[PDB]
Amino acid sequence: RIQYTYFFPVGLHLPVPRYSTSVSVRGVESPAIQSTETWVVNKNNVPLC
Amino acid sequence: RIQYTYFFPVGLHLPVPRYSTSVSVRGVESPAIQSTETWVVNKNNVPLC
Amino acid sequence: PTPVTSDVAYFQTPSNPRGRAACVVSCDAYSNESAERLLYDHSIPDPAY
Amino acid sequence: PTLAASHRVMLDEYMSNKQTHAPVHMGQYLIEEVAPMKRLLKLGNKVVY
């Protein structure tokens, strides 16, 4: 058996010159929004918040 | 032990008829902001400022 | 707890959960005081950054 | 010359697509390296020779 440790963030900010690179994403881009959660992928590939 | 020199500029300013080539980047297209830094990739692939 | 403005570019690369890299193997052998200077001092900017 | 993207987007566009990256955008610019050795560039899981 081999043990690992998994570093993981949640709930940050980004600096003032906000940018993008994505071609296809529509709704999210408002600057007034703030993310309060992050999603992970489990062993059985089920996303949890 | 072969020793190579390198260079890169920082803090420049493009001329007046500003142009575009890419199709992805959105948020930096204002003519007011100016870069005061450059990002150079380290040996272990970690982008320093 | 971790500030709102910690940079995301720290998070794509494998590192330590504290803000300072804690690799002591690089330090001098049988030197306890020189090994503490990696962890806690701030006159010495990071062994990573 | 080395990699030197004057903003965080340009280095994250040269990673995402080697061909259609902008050498010079409206505000910032990029220097694609012409070096005697040529490395791998692992930023996450996207690799550019």
- Closest to C13 in 3D by CA, of A18, B43, D3: B43
HSE-CB at D11 with a 13 A cutoff on CA atoms is 22
C15: which chain A residues are within 8 Å (Cβ-Cβ)?
A: 7
- Residues in contact with B6: Cβ distance below 8 Å, sequence separation at least 6, in sequence order: D1, D2, D35
CB contact under 8 A, A20 and B23: no
B24: which chain A residues are within 8 Å (Cβ-Cβ)?
A: 20-23
A25: nearest CA partner in chain B: B24
Give the distance from residue A49's alpha carbon to the nearest chain B alpha carbon, in angstroms.
29
CB contact under 8 A, D1 and B6: yes
CB contact under 8 A, A17 and B27: yes
Best mutation target, C10, C12, C15, to test chain D (most D CBs within 10 A)? C12
- Residues in contact with B14: Cβ distance below 8 Å, sequence separation at least 6, in sequence order: D24, D26, D27, D29
C12: nearest CA partner in chain D: D44
Determine how β-strand A47-48 pairs with β-strand B47-48: unpaired
Contacts for D10-17 with beta carbons within 8 Å, 24 or more apart? D10/B25, D11/B39, D11/B41, D11/B47, D12/A21, D12/D43, D13/A21, D13/B22, D13/B24, D13/B25, D14/D48, D15/D41, D15/D43, D15/D46, D15/D48, D16/A21, D16/B24, D16/D46
Could you tell me the resolution of this structure in angstroms? Answer: 4.3
What experiment produced this structure? cryo-EM
